[PDB]
Short mmCIF file of all heavy atoms in Angstrom, two decimals:
data_model
loop_
_atom_site.label_atom_id
_atom_site.label_comp_id
_atom_site.label_asym_id
_atom_site.label_seq_id
_atom_site.Cartn_x
_atom_site.Cartn_y
_atom_site.Cartn_z
N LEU A 417 19.74 36.15 -3.08
CA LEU A 417 19.12 37.09 -2.10
C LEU A 417 17.83 37.71 -2.59
O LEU A 417 17.69 38.12 -3.77
CB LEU A 417 20.17 38.13 -1.73
CG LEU A 417 19.74 39.14 -0.66
CD1 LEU A 417 19.54 38.48 0.69
CD2 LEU A 417 20.80 40.29 -0.57
N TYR A 418 16.82 37.84 -1.72
CA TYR A 418 15.61 38.47 -2.11
C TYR A 418 15.04 39.50 -1.11
O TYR A 418 15.39 39.47 0.08
CB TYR A 418 14.55 37.39 -2.35
CG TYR A 418 13.94 36.75 -1.06
CD1 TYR A 418 13.05 37.48 -0.27
CD2 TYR A 418 14.37 35.47 -0.67
CE1 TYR A 418 12.57 36.92 0.97
CE2 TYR A 418 13.90 34.92 0.54
CZ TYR A 418 13.00 35.66 1.38
OH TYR A 418 12.60 35.14 2.57
N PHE A 419 14.21 40.39 -1.62
CA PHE A 419 13.54 41.40 -0.83
C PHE A 419 12.06 41.26 -1.16
O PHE A 419 11.63 41.61 -2.27
CB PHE A 419 14.07 42.79 -1.20
CG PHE A 419 13.46 43.91 -0.40
CD1 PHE A 419 13.86 44.12 0.93
CD2 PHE A 419 12.61 44.82 -1.00
CE1 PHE A 419 13.34 45.22 1.68
CE2 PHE A 419 12.09 45.92 -0.31
CZ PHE A 419 12.48 46.11 1.05
N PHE A 420 11.29 40.70 -0.23
CA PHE A 420 9.86 40.50 -0.42
C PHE A 420 9.06 41.72 0.06
O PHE A 420 9.02 42.04 1.25
CB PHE A 420 9.40 39.27 0.35
CG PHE A 420 7.96 38.96 0.19
CD1 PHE A 420 7.54 38.14 -0.84
CD2 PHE A 420 7.01 39.46 1.08
CE1 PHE A 420 6.17 37.79 -0.98
CE2 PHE A 420 5.64 39.09 0.98
CZ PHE A 420 5.24 38.26 -0.05
N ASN A 421 8.43 42.42 -0.90
CA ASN A 421 7.69 43.65 -0.56
C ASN A 421 6.31 43.69 -1.11
O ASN A 421 5.81 44.77 -1.50
CB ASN A 421 8.52 44.90 -0.95
CG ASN A 421 8.76 45.02 -2.45
OD1 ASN A 421 8.57 44.04 -3.18
ND2 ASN A 421 9.27 46.14 -2.91
N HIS A 422 5.64 42.52 -1.18
CA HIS A 422 4.29 42.56 -1.66
C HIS A 422 3.31 42.53 -0.47
O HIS A 422 3.33 41.64 0.36
CB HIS A 422 3.91 41.38 -2.60
CG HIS A 422 2.48 41.43 -3.03
ND1 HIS A 422 1.96 42.36 -3.87
CD2 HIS A 422 1.40 40.64 -2.66
CE1 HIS A 422 0.65 42.23 -4.00
NE2 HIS A 422 0.28 41.19 -3.27
N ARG A 423 2.45 43.52 -0.38
CA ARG A 423 1.46 43.57 0.65
C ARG A 423 0.20 42.84 0.08
O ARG A 423 -0.41 43.27 -0.89
CB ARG A 423 1.15 45.04 1.00
CG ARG A 423 -0.21 45.32 1.63
CD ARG A 423 -0.15 45.36 3.12
NE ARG A 423 -1.46 45.63 3.70
CZ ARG A 423 -1.63 45.85 5.01
NH1 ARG A 423 -0.56 45.84 5.83
NH2 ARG A 423 -2.87 46.05 5.51
N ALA A 424 -0.17 41.69 0.67
CA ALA A 424 -1.32 40.88 0.23
C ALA A 424 -2.65 41.62 0.28
O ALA A 424 -3.02 42.33 1.26
CB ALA A 424 -1.39 39.59 1.04
N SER A 425 -3.43 41.45 -0.79
CA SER A 425 -4.72 42.08 -1.00
C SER A 425 -5.70 41.75 0.10
O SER A 425 -6.49 42.60 0.46
CB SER A 425 -5.31 41.68 -2.37
OG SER A 425 -5.48 40.25 -2.43
N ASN A 426 -5.62 40.53 0.66
CA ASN A 426 -6.54 40.13 1.73
C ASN A 426 -5.95 40.27 3.15
O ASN A 426 -6.47 39.56 4.09
CB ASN A 426 -6.91 38.64 1.51
CG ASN A 426 -5.65 37.70 1.40
OD1 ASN A 426 -4.53 38.13 1.67
ND2 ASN A 426 -5.87 36.44 0.99
N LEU A 427 -4.93 41.06 3.33
CA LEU A 427 -4.34 41.19 4.69
C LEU A 427 -5.31 41.74 5.73
O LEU A 427 -5.96 42.78 5.51
CB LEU A 427 -3.12 42.12 4.68
CG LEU A 427 -1.73 41.58 5.09
CD1 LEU A 427 -1.14 42.68 5.95
CD2 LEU A 427 -1.75 40.29 5.90
N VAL A 428 -5.39 41.09 6.88
CA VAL A 428 -6.33 41.57 7.91
C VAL A 428 -5.68 42.57 8.83
O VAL A 428 -6.40 43.24 9.62
CB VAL A 428 -6.93 40.40 8.72
CG1 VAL A 428 -7.61 39.43 7.74
CG2 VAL A 428 -5.77 39.66 9.48
N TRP A 429 -4.35 42.73 8.78
CA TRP A 429 -3.65 43.70 9.67
C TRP A 429 -3.73 45.10 9.08
O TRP A 429 -3.79 45.28 7.84
CB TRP A 429 -2.14 43.28 9.87
CG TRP A 429 -1.97 41.95 10.65
CD1 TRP A 429 -1.66 40.74 10.13
CD2 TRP A 429 -2.08 41.79 12.06
NE1 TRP A 429 -1.57 39.81 11.13
CE2 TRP A 429 -1.79 40.44 12.35
CE3 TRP A 429 -2.34 42.67 13.11
CZ2 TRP A 429 -1.76 39.92 13.64
CZ3 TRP A 429 -2.35 42.13 14.44
CH2 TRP A 429 -2.05 40.77 14.68
N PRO A 430 -3.71 46.12 9.94
CA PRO A 430 -3.77 47.51 9.42
C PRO A 430 -2.63 47.82 8.43
O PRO A 430 -1.57 47.18 8.45
CB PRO A 430 -3.70 48.35 10.63
CG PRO A 430 -2.76 47.52 11.55
CD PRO A 430 -3.38 46.17 11.39
N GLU A 431 -2.91 48.82 7.61
CA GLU A 431 -1.98 49.30 6.61
C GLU A 431 -0.60 49.72 7.10
O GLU A 431 0.41 49.43 6.44
CB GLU A 431 -2.63 50.48 5.87
CG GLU A 431 -2.68 50.30 4.38
CD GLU A 431 -3.66 49.20 3.95
OE2 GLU A 431 -3.44 48.53 2.90
N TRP A 432 -0.55 50.43 8.22
CA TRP A 432 0.72 50.89 8.75
C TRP A 432 1.73 49.73 9.00
O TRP A 432 2.90 49.98 8.98
CB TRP A 432 0.50 51.71 10.01
CG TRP A 432 0.17 50.93 11.27
CD1 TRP A 432 -1.07 50.81 11.83
CD2 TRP A 432 1.07 50.24 12.20
NE1 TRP A 432 -0.99 50.10 13.02
CE2 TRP A 432 0.31 49.76 13.30
CE3 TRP A 432 2.47 50.00 12.21
CZ2 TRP A 432 0.87 49.04 14.36
CZ3 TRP A 432 3.05 49.31 13.26
CH2 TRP A 432 2.23 48.85 14.34
N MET A 433 1.25 48.53 9.13
CA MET A 433 2.18 47.42 9.38
C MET A 433 2.93 46.94 8.13
O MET A 433 3.93 46.23 8.24
CB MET A 433 1.47 46.26 10.06
CG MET A 433 1.13 46.59 11.52
SD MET A 433 0.01 45.34 12.32
CE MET A 433 1.21 44.04 12.74
N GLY A 434 2.48 47.38 6.94
CA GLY A 434 3.15 47.02 5.68
C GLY A 434 3.30 45.52 5.32
O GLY A 434 2.32 44.74 5.46
N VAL A 435 4.47 45.10 4.92
CA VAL A 435 4.81 43.75 4.58
C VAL A 435 5.45 43.17 5.86
O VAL A 435 6.68 43.31 6.16
CB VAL A 435 5.77 43.74 3.38
CG1 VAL A 435 5.91 42.31 2.84
CG2 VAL A 435 5.19 44.67 2.30
N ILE A 436 4.56 42.55 6.66
CA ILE A 436 4.82 41.97 7.96
C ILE A 436 5.72 40.77 8.04
O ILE A 436 5.81 39.96 7.11
CB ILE A 436 3.46 41.71 8.59
CG1 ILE A 436 2.64 43.04 8.56
CG2 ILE A 436 3.61 41.18 10.01
CD1 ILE A 436 1.19 42.78 8.84
N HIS A 437 6.42 40.67 9.18
CA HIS A 437 7.29 39.56 9.48
C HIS A 437 6.41 38.35 9.46
O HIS A 437 5.41 38.28 10.14
CB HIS A 437 7.85 39.77 10.88
CG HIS A 437 8.98 38.82 11.26
ND1 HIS A 437 10.17 38.77 10.58
CD2 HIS A 437 9.09 37.97 12.33
CE1 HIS A 437 10.98 37.92 11.24
NE2 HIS A 437 10.36 37.43 12.29
N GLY A 438 6.79 37.38 8.62
CA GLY A 438 6.07 36.10 8.54
C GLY A 438 5.10 36.00 7.35
O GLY A 438 4.68 34.88 7.03
N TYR A 439 4.83 37.09 6.68
CA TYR A 439 3.85 37.07 5.64
C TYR A 439 4.27 36.68 4.24
O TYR A 439 3.45 36.75 3.29
CB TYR A 439 3.03 38.36 5.65
CG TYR A 439 1.94 38.28 6.71
CD1 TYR A 439 2.31 38.34 8.07
CD2 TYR A 439 0.59 37.95 6.39
CE1 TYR A 439 1.37 38.08 9.11
CE2 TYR A 439 -0.37 37.67 7.43
CZ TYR A 439 0.04 37.73 8.79
OH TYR A 439 -0.83 37.45 9.83
N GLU A 440 5.52 36.27 4.12
CA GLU A 440 5.95 35.71 2.83
C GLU A 440 5.70 34.16 2.95
O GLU A 440 5.56 33.51 1.94
CB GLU A 440 7.44 36.00 2.53
CG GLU A 440 8.42 34.96 3.15
CD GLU A 440 8.47 35.00 4.67
OE1 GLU A 440 7.90 35.95 5.33
OE2 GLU A 440 9.09 34.08 5.25
N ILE A 441 5.60 33.65 4.15
CA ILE A 441 5.42 32.20 4.31
C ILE A 441 4.21 31.61 3.51
O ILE A 441 4.33 30.59 2.81
CB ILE A 441 5.23 31.84 5.82
CG1 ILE A 441 6.47 32.31 6.60
CG2 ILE A 441 4.83 30.34 5.97
CD1 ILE A 441 6.43 32.12 8.12
N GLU A 442 3.06 32.31 3.60
CA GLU A 442 1.85 31.85 2.90
C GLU A 442 2.08 31.78 1.35
O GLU A 442 1.48 30.97 0.67
CB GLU A 442 0.65 32.79 3.26
CG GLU A 442 0.83 34.26 2.93
CD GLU A 442 -0.15 35.18 3.73
OE1 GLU A 442 -0.29 35.07 4.95
OE2 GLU A 442 -0.80 36.03 3.07
N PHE A 443 3.04 32.59 0.86
CA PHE A 443 3.32 32.52 -0.57
C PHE A 443 4.28 31.33 -0.77
O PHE A 443 4.23 30.69 -1.82
CB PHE A 443 3.96 33.80 -1.08
CG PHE A 443 2.95 34.88 -1.37
CD1 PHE A 443 2.52 35.71 -0.30
CD2 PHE A 443 2.37 35.02 -2.63
CE1 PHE A 443 1.49 36.64 -0.49
CE2 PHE A 443 1.35 35.95 -2.83
CZ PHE A 443 0.89 36.74 -1.77
N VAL A 444 5.15 31.10 0.22
CA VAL A 444 6.08 29.99 0.04
C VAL A 444 5.35 28.65 0.13
O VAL A 444 5.71 27.70 -0.61
CB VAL A 444 7.20 30.03 1.10
CG1 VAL A 444 7.85 28.66 1.26
CG2 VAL A 444 8.23 31.12 0.71
N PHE A 445 4.30 28.59 0.98
CA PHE A 445 3.54 27.36 1.10
C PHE A 445 2.33 27.23 0.14
O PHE A 445 1.54 26.28 0.23
CB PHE A 445 3.08 27.16 2.56
CG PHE A 445 4.15 26.58 3.37
CD1 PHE A 445 5.23 27.41 3.84
CD2 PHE A 445 4.18 25.22 3.68
CE1 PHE A 445 6.30 26.89 4.57
CE2 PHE A 445 5.27 24.67 4.42
CZ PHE A 445 6.29 25.50 4.85
N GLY A 446 2.21 28.20 -0.76
CA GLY A 446 1.19 28.16 -1.79
C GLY A 446 -0.27 28.40 -1.43
O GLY A 446 -1.11 28.00 -2.24
N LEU A 447 -0.56 29.05 -0.32
CA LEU A 447 -1.93 29.35 0.08
C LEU A 447 -2.71 30.16 -1.00
O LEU A 447 -3.92 30.00 -1.12
CB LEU A 447 -2.00 30.11 1.40
CG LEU A 447 -1.61 29.30 2.65
CD1 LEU A 447 -2.78 28.98 3.48
CD2 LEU A 447 -0.94 28.03 2.28
N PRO A 448 -2.04 31.01 -1.77
CA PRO A 448 -2.82 31.74 -2.80
C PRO A 448 -3.37 30.88 -3.90
O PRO A 448 -4.14 31.31 -4.68
CB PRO A 448 -1.82 32.80 -3.32
CG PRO A 448 -1.01 33.05 -2.11
CD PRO A 448 -0.75 31.66 -1.58
N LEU A 449 -2.94 29.58 -4.01
CA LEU A 449 -3.50 28.75 -5.07
C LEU A 449 -4.90 28.25 -4.63
O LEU A 449 -5.61 27.73 -5.48
CB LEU A 449 -2.67 27.50 -5.33
CG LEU A 449 -1.18 27.50 -5.54
CD1 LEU A 449 -0.82 26.33 -6.48
CD2 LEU A 449 -0.65 28.85 -6.10
N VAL A 450 -5.31 28.42 -3.37
CA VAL A 450 -6.65 27.97 -3.03
C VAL A 450 -7.67 29.13 -3.00
O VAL A 450 -7.65 30.05 -2.17
CB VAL A 450 -6.76 27.14 -1.66
CG1 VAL A 450 -5.35 26.77 -1.11
CG2 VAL A 450 -7.60 27.79 -0.64
#
Side-chain angles (χ1 to χ4, degrees), chain A residues 417-430 432-450:
Chain A
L417 183 67
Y418 75 73
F419 181 73
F420 182 90
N421 61 349
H422 178 69
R423 157 95 179 186
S425 60
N426 55 10
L427 241 222
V428 303
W429 293 103
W432 74 258
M433 287 170 81
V435 189
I436 306 165
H437 189 63
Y439 280 71
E440 85 294 349
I441 300 176
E442 58 199 51
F443 281 83
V444 160
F445 280 76
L447 291 252
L449 314 208
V450 352

